[PDB]
Design a protein around this ligand. Structure first.
Ligand code: CLA
Ligand code: CLA
Ligand code: CLA
Ligand code: CLA
Ligand code: CLA
Ligand code: CLA
Ligand code: CLA
Ligand code: CLA
Ligand SMILES: CC(=O)O[C@H]1CC(C)(C)C(=C=C/C(C)=C/C=C/C(C)=C/C=C/C=C(C)/C=C/C=C(C)/C=C/[C@@]23O[C@]2(C)C[C@@H](O)CC3(C)C)[C@](C)(O)C1
Ligand SMILES: CC1=C(/C=C/C(C)=C/C=C/C(C)=C\C=C\C=C(C)\C=C\C=C(C)\C=C\C2=C(C)CCCC2(C)C)C(C)(C)CCC1
Ligand SMILES: CC1=C(C/C=C(\C)CCC[C@H](C)CCC[C@H](C)CCCC(C)C)C(=O)c2ccccc2C1=O
Lengths: 169, 194, 70, 665, 86
């Protein structure tokens, strides 16, 4: 009923994990299981040291995740997908970095294909040119927008096979 | 023809004509594989960034801007610094990078068509002081390259000394220093086996 | 005695007329250019790329477990 | 002999061996054909001498691979195993020479095996094998690993050398009399005698000391000392629950002597009925004939190994190591099935490439009677199960086929060991117990016979109708591996021997799955378990003896075996030991389902979809010049078959191993 | 029986005729192409529908087309051996 409620923080189905009984209970149970597994081995064992490391990892994970939101019923940390950047466990940062990396891969590849234009080069990679294109693909956003704008990205559909014939010729 | 630096290896033929190549040293043939113009541009860039980086690495441990909480271990200064000011540094670096190369920033775009006639490392910055005589100009270019390479190695050494000591740079051996044996502690294959 | 065998792998074979003291290398003739071409084959290129990528992801998981930063 | 012709220039050609691949990489079908025909040395460029060269050198290279694998096993036992703890106390500590990393929480996979060791419990019986061999020290295991690595290097060198030592004149591989005589007298006879010597001189003292409880280095570094007059197999080591190793050594000595005698009588020509086999001798001097015969021989030997490794105990403590015996049986049964279908395949290839024997000229009666016996066997055997299901559901147990109701007694299943009454136990476990056969065993055995006969039907039809048939008369011209002859004559899908194998593999997998389930359930219900106290013991079996009561119905199989015993694997996520097994269960289900994609769909849909997709790539100027193509028909069948079998085998593997691991620990 | 039709794109290479398993096709003189011959299908009653002619046709799309007609199946088109409809 208010613009303030638009944020995922002000929702009745979620709560901060550090204040969530279910989250606390789940972690407490995980820690108990790890400690019980550790107790089986001898005190000075390498496996004992590894279990101490794992217990430390669990405690640090609990501390780090305490800030994230999680549902009241189950108390598991949630991922925010509304588009709010300044929120813990936001999907935008991983989304943006992955989109950049994936566009990098696609651009590099398309550029190698355009530069080579040969099945022989497709089979036996021209490793120098391939590495050059991989390095060059870092400016892919600007390069791709410029090519789209200037008409060097897409070719008219009349230049490519449309598909099967659906009518009489 | 054996390379001067490595008299047991063939002389590289594609790196000629550049300052600082007196001891022709390309054992892995990188100049053969890629364009020496791009390689030299990258080498200059690394040298300049690294010599500025060494000076800043030394300075930050003592002197900081008003405010700007300090970090004796200069490796942690990135985290301790104001994020907005660090982003300003990144913004200025990006502006300079884009403007200097006009938009031909990539391995293919740069040194292609127009801009190929540009010297590998020349960004037309502070060229008023370049001596007219070619001998002195080449000597100055070699001095720049030598200082840059030494700065690259020095910055690597600074960072890794900070990592091993887990402390500030200037005291080379902290109080009670016994050796760097315990720094690389994460389990390895042979280490775990033995 | 030299004989043509009509085999692509061993076009010619030599027999001795008597006891001989000669060098007959058993090592293969491998050229760095041939090795570089073999590695340039798309399979080796992409397998090396994927192995490096997988190693990088595994090492990232090792160094920064559980994504505490996120 | 001339090694100047071995250069790495051909390494980058990628298709030099096949002339049909000369027009390199016009499509992805080229890549797939390259892989498919990589090892088909017969159709490759060259000559018969080159074919023999490749065959022998590849055999040696594979020998080196196996030696490398064995050396890795020995190294893992030596350095990454709890073999010391297992040797001192086998019962308490489960075998484990397998350790996992702690990358992403993956350390959970390692489970408690000993006080100082955490890892994955192995099921290959390598610890028991080492104990039988007398390996009791890390130094001994290390030197075994070194020997295996040296053998790997030697075999690799031999392959590389023989690629050029053998010339077009080479004919030593065609000397079948010499080959067979050498293998029979030296490889088998002398080998068995030498291993008997090894046992007598090394393993017998060490094993006797271990049974006594002595662990003294001086002792570790008088045959028949402890063995009574009791027949071998009639009395197991009370402290180990296995046949006496001195009896095993005497067995190997006798077997070697018998093999040497057979070889010597063959050498002297004492065997007289050469004519009865002369026809086969002339016909089957072919690579594929020999490959088929050897594959069938090794399949049968693998099945006999699967049965004997469990029924007859010879390794120390393997009888009580229930996961080990189960895994050994299942693994060797699967290998038997795979090598049998392989024998069928290469029989078909031999028929295609060479002239068949004269039993192919009355092939119609043979396959017709096999079809009839398959139909009758399936009808009766499976319809007894269906009758039991229907009648029990209707509420008439008195009308079903079971021990209490109408019973089908296996009259011919008669004892031959003549063992004494009772069972053999070792530290709270039943090492040996007689299997009592009834209606359930009758029904399951006839199911086994039915499945075996149907698999044999498919293989034999593929072999006999390979050259031609009433449908198509030029199948020989078509070849061995073709998808069809066309939509004509009604449709000629999967008329090739390759497709006959493609179906026989499904049927072999079905047969082996039923065999695995039968063995697993019968052993759990009627053999394995613990006991509770002349003394009489009440035996508490893991499955509680429910095979004889519930196995008579398909619903009983579904409930008491799959659903009831999948509790361990299905509920394995939280448990550190078997969470990997639960995940593999799930993933194998996924892979099996994913195989149905290729098994049901067809080439044209995917080709048209690929073209529609490629429209967008061309629009955006992404033009792949190795034009994408849908997988060929035969390749789609092969991929579907591989994924199907792998998924099913993975589900069974995880299910049985999880059950056994949890139950025994 | 099936319907085997030939179109003028035919170049008269005879591969269809050579691939015919039951000799349904034959080359006939023509002036449409340079080879001065075009495959014909006089004995379409013997066509089984294997589409080996179609497999062997070189042209970009087939100059010979076999249309299957399952409703009009005859013994010759079914390749019947054990049973006789004649
Ligand atoms: C159709 C679904 C949909 C779509 C298309 C968007 C789109 C957007 N949302 Mg989201 N949002 C959604 C559902 C959706 N939302 C729902 C259901 C809610 C209620 C919980 C919200 C609540 C919400 C908030 C509270 C915020 C967003 C923000 C954003 C922006 C993210 C990208 C950005 O930062 O651009 C602009 C570039 C910078 C964008 C306008 C964020 C935004 O605009 O940040 C600036 C923001 O603050 N959204
Ligand atoms: C490439 C070289 C390089 C890089 C990456 C940085 C990076 C940084 N410097 Mg700078 N610095 C440099 C060269 C460099 N410096 C040089 C050559 C000098 C000598 C004049 C300095 C002197 C300097 C001071 C005196 C301070 C920084 C500080 C900083 C941090 C924030 C402010 C800023 O960036 O401006 C940031 C981590 C600030 C800091 O201490 O942050 C914690 C700060 O106060 N720098
Ligand atoms: C870090 C911040 C930063 C800053 C301040 C700048 C600044 C600039 N960039 Mg950009 N640039 C950046 C990051 C940055 N860049 C990054 C990360 C990349 C790689 C993806 C690029 C790649 C890039 C290219 C390829 C080009 C620019 C250009 C420009 C100009 C901006 C034109 C504009 O926005 O017109 C209003 C809209 C200016 C010199 C252009 C330029 O300098 O043309 C002469 C140009 O062609 N930049
Ligand atoms: C880009 C990917 C990448 C990165 C950033 C690293 C980074 C690291 N690896 Mg390596 N590693 C990689 C790929 C990568 N690895 C791959 C693909 C493998 C599989 C073989 C390994 C296997 C591996 C092991 C087993 C170990 C390391 C170790 C290390 C560390 C020291 C450097 C080293 O030994 O490299 C090695 C890099 C290789 C590619 C291995 C070479 C493989 C063959 C022999 C070809 C040459 C360092 C954190 C060691 C360490 O410090 O552990 C504490 C260590 O024990 N790595
Ligand atoms: C059948 C053969 C075989 C198999 C299946 C395995 C399997 C394994 N070995 Mg290996 N091993 C073998 C033979 C084999 N070994 C042999 C012959 C030796 C020497 C005689 C060793 C010596 C050895 C050691 C010393 C160790 C292993 C370990 C391992 C495990 C981890 C490997 C790893 O991290 O690779 C990493 C990935 C790569 C190396 C990439 C391979 C491909 C690129 C191109 C290189 C894994 C279960 C490790 C283990 O169990 O740790 C707990 C371990 O420490 N093995
Ligand atoms: C299956 C195993 C196997 C078989 C059947 C053969 C068969 C043969 N080898 Mg041997 N060889 C093997 C493994 C095997 N090899 C291995 C693993 C290596 C690597 C060490 C070699 C290395 C090798 C060499 C270097 C030579 C032979 C030769 C021979 C011939 C026997 C003459 C001889 O010296 O006999 C006595 C034993 C014959 C072609 C010789 C040959 O062909 O001479 C004309 C020959 O020169 N072999
Ligand atoms: C002196 C003793 C001796 C020994 C120990 C062997 C051992 C072997 N020979 Mg034989 N061989 C011998 C003498 C011997 N050979 C002689 C005198 C000749 C005549 C020159 C041959 C000719 C010969 C040929 C032509 C071949 C063998 C092969 C083999 C291997 C077959 C194993 C196999 O398929 O198992 C099967 C086990 C399972 C399926 C499980 C094996 C390593 C075969 C091989 O692949 O060698 C590399 C093979 O093709 N041998
Ligand atoms: C020195 C004599 C001797 C000894 C002590 C053994 C001992 C053994 N043989 Mg036998 N065996 C021998 C000679 C011998 N064999 C000979 C000459 C052959 C012919 C090559 C075989 C062929 C053979 C096969 C094929 C098998 C055995 C097996 C066995 C084992 C179990 C047998 C059992 O329980 O029988 C029970 C005893 C009787 C029924 C009493 C009858 C004894 C005679 C006929 C009177 C055992 C280690 C089995 C094995 O290894 O299982 C893992 C097995 O499968 N043996
Ligand atoms: C109009 C216009 O444009 O303006 C003009 C202005 C002007 C001035 C004329 C111009 C210029 C030139 C400039 C600004 C040149 C700057 C050069 C610098 C900062 C060089 C630093 C070298 C550092 C080195 C070698 C460090 C070496 C460090 C070493 C070896 C460190 C080594 C150890 O750290 C290690 C590695 C571990 C430690 O524990 C121990 C020690 C020993 C300290 C221009 C370009 O024309 C532009
Ligand atoms: C914000 C947000 C949201 C939303 C979103 C959306 C709704 C979006 C949209 C989107 C869209 C609606 C888009 C469109 C597109 C279109 C087009 C038309 C495109 C095209 C493209 C291209 C053409 C590309 C190219 C390239 C590149 C650039 C690189 C790589 C390579 C290639 C070549 C591929 C969500 C909630 C989810 C989450 C949170 C946040
Ligand atoms: C799906 C399908 C295709 C299309 C499938 C194709 C073209 C296979 C795609 C091959 C890829 C490119 C090989 C690379 C391997 C996988 C992408 C690996 C994935 C691994 C995951 C763990 C990520 C056919 O062509 C086909 C043909 C005949 C009968 C059935 C079918 C059929 O079922």
């Amino acid at each position: 009923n208010t613009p303030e409620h638009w944020t995922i923080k002000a929702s009745k189905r979620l709560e901060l994990c550090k204040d969530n009984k279910a989250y606390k209970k789940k972690f407490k149970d995980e820690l108990y299981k790890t400690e019980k597994q550790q107790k089986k081995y001898a005190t000075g064992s390498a496996v004992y040291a590894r279990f101490n490391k794992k217990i430390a990892q669990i405690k640090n994970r609990q501390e780090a995740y305490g800030d994230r939101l999680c549902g009241k019923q189950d108390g598991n940390p949630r991922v925010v997908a509304t588009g709010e950047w300044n929120v813990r466990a936001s999907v935008m940062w991983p989304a943006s970095i992955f989109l950049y990396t994936a566009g990098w891969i696609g651009w590099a590849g398309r550029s190698y294909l355009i530069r080579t234009n040969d099945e022989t080069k497709e089979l036996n990679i021209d490793v120098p040119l391939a590495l050059t294109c991989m390095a060059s693909g870092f400016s892919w956003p600007v390069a791709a927008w410029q090519e789209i704008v200037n008409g060097e990205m897409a070719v008219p559909s009349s230049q490519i096979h449309p598909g099967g014939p659906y009518t009489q010729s | 023809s054996s390379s001067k630096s490595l008299p047991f290896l063939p002389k590289p033929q594609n790196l000629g004509g550049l300052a600082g190549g007196d001891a022709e040293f390309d054992p892995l043939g990188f100049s053969d594989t890629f364009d020496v113009k791009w390689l030299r541009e990258s080498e200059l860039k690394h040298g300049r960034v690294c010599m500025l980086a060494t000076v800043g690495f030394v300075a930050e441990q003592y002197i900081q801007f008003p405010g700007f909480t300090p970090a004796e271990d200069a490796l942690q200064a990135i985290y301790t610094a104001p994020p907005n000011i660090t982003a300003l540094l990144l913004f200025a670096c990006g502006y300079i990078e884009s403007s200097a190369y006009d938009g031909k920033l990539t391995m293919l775009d740069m040194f292609d068509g127009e801009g190929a006639k540009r010297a590998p490392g020349d960004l037309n910055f502070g060229k008023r002081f370049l001596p007219g005589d070619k001998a002195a100009a080449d000597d100055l270019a070699t001095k720049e390259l030598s200082n840059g390479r030494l700065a690259m190695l020095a910055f690597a050494g600074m960072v890794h000394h900070n990592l091993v000591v887990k402390g500030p740079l200037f005291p080379l051996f902290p109080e009670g220093w016994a050796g760097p044996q315990g720094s690389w502690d994460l389990d390895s294959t042979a280490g775990a086996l033995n | 005695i030299v004989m043509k065998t009509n085999d692509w792998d061993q076009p010619e074979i030599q027999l001795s007329t008597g006891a001989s003291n000669q060098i007959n290398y058993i090592t293969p003739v491998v050229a760095s250019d041939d090795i570089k071409a073999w590695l340039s084959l798309n399979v080796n290129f992409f397998s090396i790329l994927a192995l490096l990528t997988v190693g990088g992801i595994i090492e990232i998981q090792r160094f920064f477990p559980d994504t505490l930063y996120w | 002999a001339i090694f100047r012709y071995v250069n790495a220039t051909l390494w980058s050609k990628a298709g030099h061996f096949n002339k049909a691949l000369s027009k390199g990489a016009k499509t992805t079908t080229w890549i797939w054909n390259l892989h498919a025909s990589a090892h088909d040395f017969d159709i490759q460029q060259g000559s018969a001498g080159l074919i023999a060269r490749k065959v022998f050198s590849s055999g040696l290279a594979h020998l080196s691979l196996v030696f490398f694998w064995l050396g890795g096993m020995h190294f893992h036992g030596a350095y990454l195993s709890n073999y010391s703890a297992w040797l001192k106390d086998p019962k308490s500590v489960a075998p484990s020479s397998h350790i996992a990393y702690s990358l992403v929480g993956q350390d959970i996979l390692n489970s408690y095996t000993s006080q100082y060791f955490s890892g994955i419990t192995i099921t290959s019986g390598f610890f028991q094998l080492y104990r039988s061999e007398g390996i009791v020290t890390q130094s001994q295991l290390k030197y075994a690993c070194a020997a295996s690595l040296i053998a790997t290097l030697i075999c690799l060198s031999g392959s590389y050398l023989h690629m050029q030592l053998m010339s077009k004149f080479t004919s030593f591989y065609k000397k079948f009399q010499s080959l067979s005589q050498s293998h029979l007298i030296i490889m088998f006879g002398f080998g068995s005698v030498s291993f008997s010597a090894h046992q007598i001189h090394e393993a017998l003292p060490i094993n006797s000391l271990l049974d006594s409880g002595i662990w003294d280095p001086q002792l570790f570094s008088a045959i028949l000392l402890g063995t009574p007059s009791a027949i071998t197999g009639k009395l197991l080591n009370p402290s180990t629950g296995s046949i006496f190793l001195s009896q095993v050594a005497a067995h190997h000595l006798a077997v070697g002597i018998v093999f040497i005698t057979l070889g010597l009588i063959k050498w002297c020509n004492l065997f007289f009925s050469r004519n009865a086999i002369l026809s086969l001798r002339l016909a089957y001097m072919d690579y594929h004939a020999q490959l088929s015969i050897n594959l069938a021989v090794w399949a049968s030997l693998s099945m006999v190994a699967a049965h004997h490794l469990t029924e007859i105990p010879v390794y120390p403590y393997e009888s009580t190591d229930y996961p080990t015996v189960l895994c050994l049986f299942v693994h060797h049964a699967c290998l038997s099935g795979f090598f049998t279908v392989a024998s069928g395949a290469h029989a078909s290839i031999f028929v295609i490439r060479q002239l068949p024997t004269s039993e192919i000229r009355h092939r119609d009666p043979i396959i017709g009677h096999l079809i009839w016996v398959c139909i009758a066997l399936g009808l009766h055997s499976f319809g007894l199960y269906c009758h039991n299901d229907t009648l029990e559901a209707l509420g008439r147990p008195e009308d079903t086929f079971c021990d209490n109701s109408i019973q089908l007694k296996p009259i011919f299943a008669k004892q031959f060991l003549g063992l004494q009454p009772g069972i053999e136990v070792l530290d709270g476990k039943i090492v040996r117990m007689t299997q009592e056969l009834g209606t359930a065993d009758f029904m399951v055995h006839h199911i086994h016979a039915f499945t075996i006969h149907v698999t044999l039907l498919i293989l034999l039809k593929g072999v006999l109708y390979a050259r031609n048939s009433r449908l198509v008369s030029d199948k020989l011209e078509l070849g061995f591996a073709y998808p069809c002859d066309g939509p004509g004559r009604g449709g000629t899908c999967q008329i090739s021997p390759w497709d006959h194998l493609f179906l026989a593999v499904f049927w072999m997998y079905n047969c082996l799955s039923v065999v695995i389930f039968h063995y697993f359930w019968k052993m759990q219900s009627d053999v394995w378990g613990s006991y509770v106290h002349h003394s009489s013991l009440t035996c508490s079996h893991y499955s509680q003896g429910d095979f004889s009561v519930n196995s008579i119905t398909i619903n009983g199989w579904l409930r008491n075996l799959l659903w009831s015993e999948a509790s361990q694997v299905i509920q394995s996520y939280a448990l550190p030991s078997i969470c990997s097994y639960g995940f593999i269960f799930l993933a194998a289900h996924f892979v099996w389902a994913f195989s149905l994609m290729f098994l049901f769909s067809g080439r044209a849909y995917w080709q048209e979809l690929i073209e529609s997709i490629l429209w967008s790539h061309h629009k955006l100027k992404i033009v792949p010049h190795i034009q994408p193509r849908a997988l060929s028909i035969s390749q789609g069948r092969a991929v579907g078959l591989t994924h199907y079998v792998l998924g099913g085998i993975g589900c069974t593997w995880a299910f049985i191993i999880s059950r056994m691991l949890v139950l025994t620990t | 029986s099936h319907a085997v039709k030939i179109y003028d794109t035919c170049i008269g290479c005879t591969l269809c005729v050579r691939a015919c398993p039951t000799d349904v096709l034959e080359m006939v003189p023509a002036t449409v192409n340079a080879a001065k011959q075009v495959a014909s299908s006089p004995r379409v009653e013997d066509c089984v529908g294997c589409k080996r002619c179609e497999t062997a046709c070189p042209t970009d799309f087939l100059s010979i087309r076999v249309y299957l007609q399952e409703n009009e199946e005859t013994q010759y088109s079914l390749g019947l051996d054990l049973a006789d409809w004649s």
